Amino acid sequence: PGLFLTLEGLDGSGKTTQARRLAAFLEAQGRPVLLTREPGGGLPEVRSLLLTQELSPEAEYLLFSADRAEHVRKVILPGLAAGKVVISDRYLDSSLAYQGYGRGLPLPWLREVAREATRGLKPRLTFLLDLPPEAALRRVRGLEFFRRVREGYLALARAEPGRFVVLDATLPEEEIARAIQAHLRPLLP
Amino acid sequence: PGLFLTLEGLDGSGKTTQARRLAAFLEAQGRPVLLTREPGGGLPEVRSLLLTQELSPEAEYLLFSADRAEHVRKVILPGLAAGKVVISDRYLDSSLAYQGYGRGLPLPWLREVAREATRGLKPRLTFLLDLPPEAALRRVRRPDRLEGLGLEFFRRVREGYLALARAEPGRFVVLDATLPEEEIARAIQAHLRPLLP
Ligand SMILES: Nc1ncnc2c1ncn2[C@@H]1O[C@H](COP(=O)(O)OP(=O)(O)OP(=O)(O)O)[C@@H](O)[C@H]1O
Ligand SMILES: [Cl-]
Ligand SMILES: [Cl-]
Ligand SMILES: [Cl-]
Ligand SMILES: [Cl-]
Ligand SMILES: [Cl-]
Ligand SMILES: [Mg+2]
Ligand SMILES: [Mg+2]
Ligand SMILES: [Mg+2]
């Protein structure tokens, strides 16, 4: 039993908003739900090292992967074992987009590290809230970096189009929330 | 038991090619398959009746519905009951796009008629092979039932499909039909991986 779902996208794309909308929707149907996030979901103390004095991208990813390893084993898998819909605000795909396409780290190395960290656990669906960097920076707070990240997410979507549900994040919140519920309707329970 | 899949788009979009390709893939993996199509899957002779002097759109839809009524009861539902993957080249969305948005018949009437014709049966997934109608028209000639229709007809049909996709985004899997044939076959395969099983 259980159903693992993730929300993905740039900063200010609406991940947390749609994650909370989905949680409350499933909760209103009386379904068990575990809303979680990355980083912090497995090892909460890793979030302090995110805001650390000029941390290298390789070390940053390995901290993410340590947290994600603990997140999978002690929170997500038990949640799935208990029949919950586990929704994670960010997952592996965040690291692949930001570290791989954004910062430039080799993808085979990232996937090699992730293979044992994640225990092979892929989301059943991943909802990619896609919008341009210019719109993303207006929502949340160089644009060349976020352009590579955006293209990375689409490259990952192109590689796994069954898993990735690509949605226009500039659409209204209701229209996006209604669409996410439509993609999940047949998967429940 | 069973899994009901449909493919949609303009003729020349590649939905026929991909429908045939999907069936061979499932046959190759030892999965029972029923490849079918509309118009003709229920009542073959309806294809001939669609070529009539100056057939009205109301009669035309009702011929499609009579055909589809029989297609659901005689072919699809028996197929699904037996555990088969039923692949239909065109289903109800074709009538909605071509006779609704194209010819201009009211959508509420079409959906009310379809409710008993289809027995409420919706496919688990519908693969829409989307492309511009100018691109579709250049690839293959239109079927004889659609003879003497301008570019603006097929634009309304193209946009009608996309409107249906917005209303049912879970069911519809919209694909770019200007991509390579292998890439579209790979994408259709990937969407069906967790459903087959
Ligand atoms: N569909 C929408 N249309 C317009 N604005 C939206 C929409 N969805 C969310 N927002 C707004 O955009 C901002 C970003 O939302 P949210 O924090 O959920 O994105 P996020 O991806 O979680 O950001 P971060 O990655 O920084 O945590 C918020 O102020 C929110 O109100
Ligand atoms: Cl996939
Ligand atoms: Cl075709
Ligand atoms: Cl339908
Ligand atoms: Cl072309
Ligand atoms: Cl839907
Ligand atoms: Mg957030
Ligand atoms: Mg990372
Ligand atoms: Mg789609």
Side-chain angles (χ1 to χ4, degrees), chain A residues 1-49 52 55-102 104-111 113-114 116-137 139-140 142 145-150 152-177 179-189, chain B residues 1-52 55-111 113-114 116-146 148-197:
Chain A
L3 186 64
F4 183 35
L5 305 169
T6 67
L7 285 91
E8 288 290 355
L10 295 163
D11 298 69
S13 60
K15 287 179 283 87
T16 313
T17 304
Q18 294 302 326
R20 290 177 187 283
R21 285 291 301 268
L22 180 51
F25 177 84
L26 296 170
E27 286 165 4
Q29 298 189 357
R31 298 182 180 283
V33 171
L34 205 177
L35 181 61
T36 189
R37 62 213 280 267
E38 288 191 349
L43 292 169
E45 302 98 323
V46 173
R47 291 180 66 79
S48 299
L49 288 304
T52 209
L55 196 76
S56 62
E58 290 88 356
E60 190 186 340
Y61 175 68
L62 294 158
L63 286 180
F64 259 86
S65 297
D67 171 45
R68 175 156 42 252
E70 210 73 1
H71 189 213
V72 167
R73 286 169 184 76
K74 288 175 180 59
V75 182
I76 300 163
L77 284 166
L80 294 170
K84 300 197 176 69
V85 177
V86 183
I87 303 162
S88 186
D89 192 338
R90 295 193 180 282
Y91 190 54
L92 179 55
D93 296 317
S94 293
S95 296
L96 298 183
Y98 281 70
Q99 310 306 135
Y101 292 93
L105 304 186
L107 276 297
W109 179 75
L110 295 169
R111 294 176 197 277
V113 172
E116 297 295 333
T118 63
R119 215 187 233 178
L121 180 63
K122 309 190 112 307
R124 176 59 188 77
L125 287 176
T126 293
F127 297 99
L128 178 58
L129 291 313
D130 187 47
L131 80 180
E134 290 154 25
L137 271 71
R139 296 275 206 84
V140 73
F145 169 77
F146 293 94
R147 193 174 297 283
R148 296 198 298 277
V149 170
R150 192 264 178 97
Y153 273 128
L154 290 176
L156 295 162
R158 179 161 40 260
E160 299 185 71
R163 184 162 72 78
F164 276 93
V165 177
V166 180
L167 295 163
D168 187 0
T170 59
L171 290 168
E173 191 187 311
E174 288 297 326
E175 198 175 320
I176 298 158
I180 291 166
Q181 292 154 26
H183 291 98
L184 296 168
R185 194 216 57 72
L187 310 193
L188 276 31
Chain B
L3 177 61
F4 184 34
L5 307 176
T6 58
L7 290 88
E8 290 291 350
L10 302 171
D11 277 2
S13 62
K15 86 266 181 302
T16 299
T17 291
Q18 293 295 333
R20 191 199 72 251
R21 283 189 68 152
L22 185 59
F25 170 82
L26 295 164
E27 284 167 5
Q29 294 193 314
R31 292 167 173 283
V33 207
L34 204 186
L35 179 54
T36 188
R37 58 181 312 287
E38 295 183 356
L43 290 163
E45 52 268 305
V46 171
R47 290 165 48 74
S48 187
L49 298 174
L50 290 163
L51 288 304
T52 297
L55 195 76
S56 76
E58 285 78 2
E60 189 182 274
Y61 175 63
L62 293 163
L63 288 175
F64 262 86
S65 294
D67 176 45
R68 180 159 39 246
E70 204 72 358
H71 197 205
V72 172
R73 291 166 180 76
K74 300 293 203 291
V75 184
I76 300 161
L77 286 175
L80 296 165
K84 302 184 172 184
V85 178
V86 182
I87 300 162
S88 190
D89 184 346
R90 307 194 173 286
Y91 185 52
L92 176 57
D93 295 309
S94 285
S95 286
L96 298 182
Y98 282 83
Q99 286 101 107
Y101 290 96
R103 287 231 150 82
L105 300 180
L107 277 291
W109 182 65
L110 297 180
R111 288 192 195 280
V113 173
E116 295 298 334
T118 63
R119 243 194 178 97
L121 184 68
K122 318 191 99 301
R124 177 62 185 79
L125 290 175
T126 299
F127 301 93
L128 178 58
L129 291 301
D130 186 56
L131 76 184
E134 298 93 335
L137 270 45
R138 260 132 43 201
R139 289 172 171 194
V140 195
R141 71 199 178 189
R142 301 304 88 183
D144 296 349
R145 71 188 193 77
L146 310 180
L149 286 166
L151 178 56
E152 300 307 291
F153 177 85
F154 299 102
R155 196 184 310 289
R156 291 195 297 285
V157 176
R158 191 265 176 109
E159 297 303 326
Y161 274 132
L162 295 177
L164 297 162
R166 279 190 288 285
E168 288 168 279
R171 187 166 65 79
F172 268 90
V173 178
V174 178
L175 298 170
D176 188 350
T178 69
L179 300 172
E181 191 177 310
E182 297 316 307
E183 197 61 23
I184 297 160
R186 195 179 71 80
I188 293 165
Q189 226 81 95
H191 286 98
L192 299 166
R193 185 183 61 77
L195 282 52
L196 290 172

